[PDB]
Design brief:
The structure is a homodimer. With 198 residues, chain A is an alpha/beta fold. The first copy, chain A, has one domain (1-198): Rossmann fold, CATH 3.40.50.360. Helix content of chain A is 41%, strand content 19%. The first copy, chain A, has 6 helices and 7 strands, in the order βαβααβαβββαβα. Chain A has helices at 17-32, 53-58, 65-83, 100-109, 150-160, 178-197, and strands at residues 3-8, 37-42, 86-90, 116-119, 122-125, 131-137, 166-171. In chain A, the strands form 2 sheets. Chain A has a 5-stranded parallel sheet, sandwiched between helices. In chain A, α1 (17-32) runs parallel beside α6 (178-197). The radius of gyration of chain A is 17 Å and the shape is globular. Bound molecules: flavin mononucleotide (FMN) (2 copies). One flavin mononucleotide (FMN) is lined by residues 10, 12, 16-19, 93-97, 138-141, 143, 175-176 of chain B. It is classed as hydrolase. Keywords: structural genomics, acyl carrier protein phosphodiesterase, FMN, Alpha/beta/alpha sandwich, PSI, Protein Structure Initiative, Midwest Center for Structural Genomics, mcsg, hydrolase. The assembly is dimeric.
Chain lengths: 198, 199
Amino acid sequence: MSKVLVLKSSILAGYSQSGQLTDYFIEQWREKHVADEITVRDLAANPVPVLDGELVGAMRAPLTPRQQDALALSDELIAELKAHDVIVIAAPMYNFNIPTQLKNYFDLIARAGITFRYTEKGPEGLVTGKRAVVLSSRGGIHKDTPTDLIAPYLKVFLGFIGITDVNFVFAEGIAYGPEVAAKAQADAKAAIDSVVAA
Amino acid sequence: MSKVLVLKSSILAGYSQSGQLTDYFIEQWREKHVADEITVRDLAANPVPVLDGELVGAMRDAPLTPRQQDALALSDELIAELKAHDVIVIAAPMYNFNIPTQLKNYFDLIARAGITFRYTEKGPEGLVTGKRAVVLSSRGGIHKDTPTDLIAPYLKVFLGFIGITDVNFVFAEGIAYGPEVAAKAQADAKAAIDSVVAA
Ligand SMILES: Cc1cc2nc3c(=O)[nH]c(=O)nc-3n(C[C@H](O)[C@H](O)[C@H](O)COP(=O)(O)O)c2cc1C
Ligand SMILES: Cc1cc2nc3c(=O)[nH]c(=O)nc-3n(C[C@H](O)[C@H](O)[C@H](O)COP(=O)(O)O)c2cc1C
C-alpha cells in the first residue's frame, strides 16, 4: 500500500485548472489502488506563512509563540512529506512564477540537516524514495520556451531535497478558448493515466 | 535629473548581503548624480500581502470587500511609484532557488492588465516604459549561468513583460564560502555597480 500526498496551491478554488487535474489524478489513483491512503493539503485553503526575518530566525535564545508555531508547522509539513510515497504537486504559473501558496510551503520544508545535508560527497537530499508528479496549468503556452522557468526551478528545488523522480504534466493554452483548453486537459489526463498505470 | 527607486527585499535586516549592495549603489549614485532623488521601499520592513483568492479578485462592477479595497489602493500606490521613477534598483537575493517572497508579493500587485501591460495589434506590450533597471542579486553558492539560476532569466522575463527591457544584472556569489571569498565577491559586485552608475 502506498500513501499519496496531494499539495494544492491554486487561489481559484472551484475554478482551478490545476485543482481539476489533481482531482482527476486522485480519482484514477483511488480506482487503481482501492487501499491506498490519500492525504490532501490545500495550501490556499490552509495557508503556510511567508518566510520572514522572525521565522527564518526560528529555523536556526527563546522563541516567541509565533516562531514556535511556525517551527511546529515546518516540522509537520516535513514529517508529512517524508511519510508519504507519492507526492502530487499542483504548480500553476502565476506571473511567470509558482503560486506564493506553494512557495511558502517550500520555504518551510527546506531545512539544513532535516531535508538535506552535506557529506563527504557534498550536498545530499534527505527526502528519499519518493515518486513525484507536478501538475502545472498555464493560461498561455510556455512549455519548452524561454518563459517557462518554473518547471526547471521545480526540478532543481525538489532535487535538492532528494526528490529526483519527478514526472511533469502540463496543461497549457487554457486562456485560448474552450477548444484549446479542452484538448490541453485531455492530453494532461492521458499523461496522468500513464503515470497511474506505470 | 533622474528619480531612483530602490526595492529592498532581504529578510536579514542589517546582515543583508543584497541590502549592503543596494546601500553601495545608493552611495555611488549619490556621488555621481548629486541632484538625483532616491526613493527606498523596504519590502521586508513594509511588507506587501500575499496574492490570494480574495486579493486577485480586487484586480478585476461587483463591490469590493474592505480587504480588496485596501489591496487595490496598495496596488495603485506601488504602480504609481514604479511609473514615477526612472531608474529601478531591485535587490533579488536567492532564497531556495527563487526570489524572496517579499519581492514576489510586490510583483503580484504590480502586474495588472490594462495598467502595466496590455494587448495590441502587436501582441502583449508593457506599459512601464523608458526605465533602466538594475538587479542586485547575492547568493550563498555559485549559480550564475548554470541550471541552478532560474531567477536571472525569470526576472528578465517578468520585467520585460511589464515593459522594463533595459535590465543590468549584478551578482555577488559564494557568500557562504567565508569572509575572504565574500569580500572579493562584494568587491567585484561594487566594480560592476560602478560601471552601471557611470553609464
Ligand atoms: C494572479 C494570476 C497570475 C497569472 N499569470 C500568468 C502568466 O504570467 N502567464 C500565463 O500564461 N498565465 C498566467 N495566469 C493564467 C493561469 O496560469 C491559468 O489560468 C492556469 O491554468 C490557472 O491555474 P489555476 O486554477 O490552477 O491556479 C495567471 C492567473 C492568475 C489568477
Ligand atoms: C531562507 C533562505 C534560503 C536560501 N537559499 C539559497 C539557495 O537556494 N542557494 C544559494 O546559493 N544560497 C541560498 N541562500 C543564501 C543566500 O542567497 C545568501 O546568504 C545571500 O547573500 C543572502 O542575501 P540576503 O541578506 O541578501 O537576502 C539562502 C538564505 C536564506 C536566509
